Amino acid sequence: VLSEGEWQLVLHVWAKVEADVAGHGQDILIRLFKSHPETLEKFDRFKHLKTEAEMKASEDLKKHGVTVLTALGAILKKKGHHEAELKPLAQSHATKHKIPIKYLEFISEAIIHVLHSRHPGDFGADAQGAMNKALELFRKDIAAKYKELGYQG
Ligand code: HEM
C-alpha cells in the first residue's frame, strides 16, 4: 500500500502533468517506441511511423497519448481503490491488444523518465520513489487479472 504521504507526492506531480496532458502523452509514447521498438509493432495504427520526427508530427499519436494518460490519471486519483477502473483495462490489454505485462513495465519506465525531464522540482527522489510504487501497484493488480484470464506472460 502507499501511505497517504506517498499518494500526496504522486498526485502533486500528476496535477502538473494535467497542465499539458497531450505533450506528456506524446513524449511518453515516443520514449516507449524508441526504447523498445517491439512495442510499436502492437499498434496497427502507428506501425507506419519510422522516425522520431514522423512520430512527433502525428496528430493521431498525440490523441492516443491523451487517451492513455487520462485513463492512468483516473486510476491514480483512486489512490489504490481502482478496481472498477482497472478491470476493463486489464481485460482489453490482455485479450484484445495482447500486451505482455513486461511492456507495462516498459511504459512505466517511460512515464518516470518523462516526469523527471519536465518537473525536476516536483520530482525529487522521494517523489520518484512514490511514483514507482504507484506504478508497481498498477502492474501487480493488472497481472492478477491477467493470471485469472490465462495470460500471465
Ligand atoms: C499506462 C498503461 C496503459 C494504459 C493506461 C493504457 C490505456 C489504454 C486505453 C485507455 C486504451 C483505449 C481503450 C482500450 O482499448 O482499452 C488503450 C488502447 C490500446 N493500448 Fe493501451 N494502455 C496502457 C499500456 C499499453 C501498452 C504498454 C501497450 C502496448 C505496447 C498498449 C497497447 C494498446 C493498443 C494496441 C491499444 C489499441 C489502440 C488502438 O488501435 O486504438 N497499451 N490503452
Regarding the beta carbon of 45 and ligand 1, being less than 6 Å apart is answered yes
Distance CA 125, CA 110 (A): 16
68: CA distance to ligand 1 center in Å? 6
Nearest CA to ligand 1 atom 24: 104
In this structure, what CATH number is given to the domain that contains residue 59? 1.10.490.10
Q: Domains in the chain: how many in total?
A: 1
Structural contact between residues 119 and 66, judged by C-beta atoms closer than 8 angstroms:
no
Task: Using DSSP, state whether 19 is helix, strand or coil.
Answer: coil
119 labelled binding-site residue = no
Burial 123-148 (b: 16+ CB within 10 A, else e): beeebeebbbbbbebbeebbbebbee
Residue type (1 letter), 23: G
> Does the Cβ of 99 fall within 6 Å of ligand 1?
yes
* Cell reading at 24: 506528456
Distance CA 7, CA 131 (A): 8
Listed resolution, Å: 1.7
Measured in whole angstroms, the distance separating CA 119 from the mean position of its chain's CA atoms is 17
Q: Please give the helix or strand (H or E) that residue 142 lies within, else none.
A: helix 125-149
Query: In whole angstroms, how far apart are CA 49 and each of 41, 46, 56, 106?
Result: 10, 6, 10, 19
40 lines ligand 1 (CB under 6 A): no
- Secondary structure of 71-127 as H, E, C letters: HHHHHHCCCCCCHHHHHHHHHHHHHHCCCCHHHHHHHHHHHHHHHHHHCHHHCCHHH
The boundaries of the domain holding residue 14 are 1-153
Method: X-ray
